[PDB]
Amino acid sequence: SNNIKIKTLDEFGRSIAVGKRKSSTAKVFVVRGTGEILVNGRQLNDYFLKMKDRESIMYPLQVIESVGKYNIFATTSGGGPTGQAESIMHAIAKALVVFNPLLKSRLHKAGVLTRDYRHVERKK
Amino acid sequence: MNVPKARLLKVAELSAKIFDQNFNPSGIRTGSKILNERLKGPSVASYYGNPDILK
Amino acid sequence: KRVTPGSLYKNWTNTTHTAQLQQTAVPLALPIFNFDDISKTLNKVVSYSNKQYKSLHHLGSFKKSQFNELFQKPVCLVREDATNSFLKKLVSHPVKKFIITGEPGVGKTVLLSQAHAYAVDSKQIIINISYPELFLNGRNDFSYDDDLKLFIQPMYLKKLIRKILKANDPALLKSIELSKDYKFSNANPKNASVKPFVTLNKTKNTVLDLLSVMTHPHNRGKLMKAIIDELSVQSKVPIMFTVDNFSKVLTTAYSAYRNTENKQIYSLDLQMGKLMMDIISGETKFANGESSTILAISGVDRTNKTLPVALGKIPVDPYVTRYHYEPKFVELLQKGNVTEFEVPKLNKQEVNELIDYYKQSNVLLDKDITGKKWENLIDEKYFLSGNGNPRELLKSLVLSHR
Amino acid sequence: SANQRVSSDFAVRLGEELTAIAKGTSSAFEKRDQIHKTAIAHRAYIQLK
Amino acid sequence: VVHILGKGFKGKEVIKIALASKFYGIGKTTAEKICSKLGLYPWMRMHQLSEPQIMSIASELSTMTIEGDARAIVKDNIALKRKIGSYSGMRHTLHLPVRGQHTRNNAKTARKLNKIDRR
Amino acid sequence: ALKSVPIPPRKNATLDHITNMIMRHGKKEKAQTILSRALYLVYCQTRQDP
RNA sequence: AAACUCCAUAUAUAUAAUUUUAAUUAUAUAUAAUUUUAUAUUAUUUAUUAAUAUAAAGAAAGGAAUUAAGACAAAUCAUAAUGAUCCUUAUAAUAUGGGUAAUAGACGUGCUAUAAUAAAAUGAUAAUAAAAUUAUAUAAAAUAUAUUUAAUUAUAUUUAAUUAAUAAUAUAAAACAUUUUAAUUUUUAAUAUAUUUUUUUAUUAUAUAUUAAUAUGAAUUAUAAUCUGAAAUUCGAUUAUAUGAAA
């Protein structure tokens, strides 16, 4: 038989997904809200200084036009700002599918549900 | 930082006494490091193997 | 020469500040800031009055890197949780000693400019120290005064005294008759060689005359002590003493100046430092009960345990090195009963008002107006600004071409 | 063209250059006309297969 | 142009930097002490100095070992090496590196400057 | 509702190309700052979309 | 031979009494792709087909190892080993010092630099890593000196913890913000001025030289001190003051 069990919201209505980019990892908690985001307990503008990194995090929510409909509590470790920002981006996209599985195709088409495999390669 | 140096020196001396440590307030070179270094002779002298092998 | 009369030769930050780029801005008709009628302007973008603009330009309330050149004149959103809340405490609290805090770019300087605008309306004399770094960086002359036992800075004091004269209503200054007789050395290039000294008799001359005394650089420290003393003894006009970027003072205990033994001079050994901390600590008491002291920190300065301890946010750690903890400043701030007012971040409704004003100012790109729903824009810009940071909001709108 | 301007900051020089180009004045339009003149001369040299 | 002990300085030059640039034997630390001793504020420029203050700098500069005196000390230390016949002295005489540098390659600067009568 | 909405563009192709040509040594943030500051100065003199 | 494979990646199960905590992890096992599906178009050897586009599904996008033959009688007798030939009071063995570091020219490979899309300072409730190392050890915090309030850097004194998912080497750095920056009179200063005030304007002074080397650059060199070692002269490393070449 198969080894896949339907993903569902937890006891507090939160969708938990993990994402990885380069050496960075991110575990996000997505709940229905008003667009509040916290990264490692800090304001988004504090943790991420580059606006391009902030825009990457928002892109999955912009695809489903739900930027003001969810509160994100993102926790990230490893790598640098770019790896962490895109690891959060990947994790938000994977956590948004639980709220509406009909939008998975649009998320896949935007490219946010694909794990980027590129990593530092030892010269050969 | 506001703690008087005399008070912090009294604590250092008493603490060193309890823990059998060398208290050198002046800072004079005493050679204590030489007296504490480990002896590497046994490891160095076994580099080529045990000489008492059956021949 | 390579530089022509109109060539933009400065760097970007100075060019935007100095190149008069607001001339092309579209004139908009906005309501005027008036705290006595805040009910009609609450949560709305307002311009300042003509009397307020003149005073605030002479005080240095408007600074570079505030995107002021996008609009014909600097504008401010009258906020309920930041502007109205702070101004009500200033009118009610008996102590009236505040320090404005908050994250970098939250709008601490704009709040101080709104407190200056209130003071101008309410017939108060404003003494503003916009950039304390100017008297701590060692880029102007300093001299030791034997009678004051302090290091005076004539170059800086001359600029400061003119700002106090040009930014405040002459009528208010003329109302304050002098309480003592003063004599200074005459430096007026017209009669300096005829009159050795200029005398200011009590009950005849006013503080307006005292602010117009041209004296030699070595006697300018005694003129600053007289001006402060005259304003601290009178009870007619309230005195609002303000210092922006006060974090620089707290984190720079030792100025760049060195004495004759090549030892850096403690900041409290300078007249500016001593005068500033005497008003904050309460040593210099003002007779009028509406006098206030509003300080503001800046995010451009380093942080340490000094201010958090002085505000009671963290316990005192005695083993912190002096470079990260100045116990003397903590004592002075706590002697003055300075209270903290943290400027809150903008809510989504306040973001809507600011973005609606920006749309009418024609500062928004075409990618945020055509093909985008208004509700989507507000949500995206509230997310990209850190959930309320005004400075990150403007940058996301006018300085993000990606 | 931007690097011939007086500002020490490249952003200022680039901004000024872009403003002049948006207002019609630019010395690089001559370069374009000279590249198009050469191409019109060699129109017969084209292969079209 | 401000002239201190013969040296000429452009008006805009900062005093502490100019002193450590034109005077042999005076570096950054020494220049700052001179300015601190004379009551000159850290970033004062030459054009600001008055004639009484220019004379005060010359007085303090004349009580130090600078210019010829400082250069003579170096020329005499190098001569002593040659007099005693030390290996280092021979290197100075032969215009070769005196601090262990290889000579199979490079060694061009030592060939131009290493000499008993070093500038 | 979403079936008839085009997927928003991740980036502007022209601005991304211009930024990378300015960029050297991987310092994209500096390159983006220069371009944004230059375009900010164009708007403040023309008052049109840079 | 390809491959099968192992690695990476995605997912599942098991293990951890979640204080050896990184559960956002660790490492055993198994699964997955050499992707699949339909649709229109264009060619064909037109068929049970290719090249394209299009929609749909999917995390799926990268690597590895090894050799089959033969040639250069290409390198190595200096990693070690073998034949032949030569030395056997010496061509073997040990000690002290010296050399391998010499310096005309030439060549290869690197480092640093010749300034403003770029260098220098500062950033303590401490922005943000990975992979390694520590019983022939890794060395914390503190104190003292250089040295100044302190910090920073260097060394000394002392030797906490850890022989390690525990403690230490070690608060990564760039980034980002502020300040500064010669050439540059594009500056600074003195007065006056302003609804640009960290700033504008006006009038004076601010140099001369100058195709050029500065507040770029850090070679060379003097002096003092330190580190390792029994020993730093030929011939090591570091610091301070001074020197400041070429470019």
Ligand SMILES: Nc1ncnc2c1ncn2[C@@H]1O[C@H](COP(=O)(O)OP(=O)(O)OP(=O)(O)O)[C@@H](O)[C@H]1O
């Ligand atoms: N109430 C407001 N209305 C309009 N603009 C505002 C308001 N508050 C802040 N801003 C804008 O936000 C930006 C930052 O404001 P401000 O300089 O006052 O912040 P700050 O916290 O004092 O900054 P720093 O930390 O650098 O000292 C500026 O562009 C300013 O114009």
Ligand SMILES: [K+]
């Ligand atoms: K010198």
Ligand SMILES: [K+]
């Ligand atoms: K040599």
Ligand SMILES: [K+]
């Ligand atoms: K060579």
Ligand SMILES: [K+]
């Ligand atoms: K040797």
Ligand SMILES: [K+]
């Ligand atoms: K440089």
Ligand SMILES: [K+]
């Ligand atoms: K030696």
Ligand SMILES: [Mg+2]
């Ligand atoms: Mg501010």
Ligand SMILES: [Mg+2]
């Ligand atoms: Mg955990």
Ligand SMILES: [Mg+2]
């Ligand atoms: Mg060799």
Ligand SMILES: [Mg+2]
């Ligand atoms: Mg350098």
Ligand SMILES: [Mg+2]
């Ligand atoms: Mg950290």
Ligand SMILES: [Mg+2]
């Ligand atoms: Mg230590």
Ligand SMILES: [Mg+2]
């Ligand atoms: Mg840090």
Ligand SMILES: [Mg+2]
């Ligand atoms: Mg740095």
Ligand SMILES: [Mg+2]
């Ligand atoms: Mg240098």
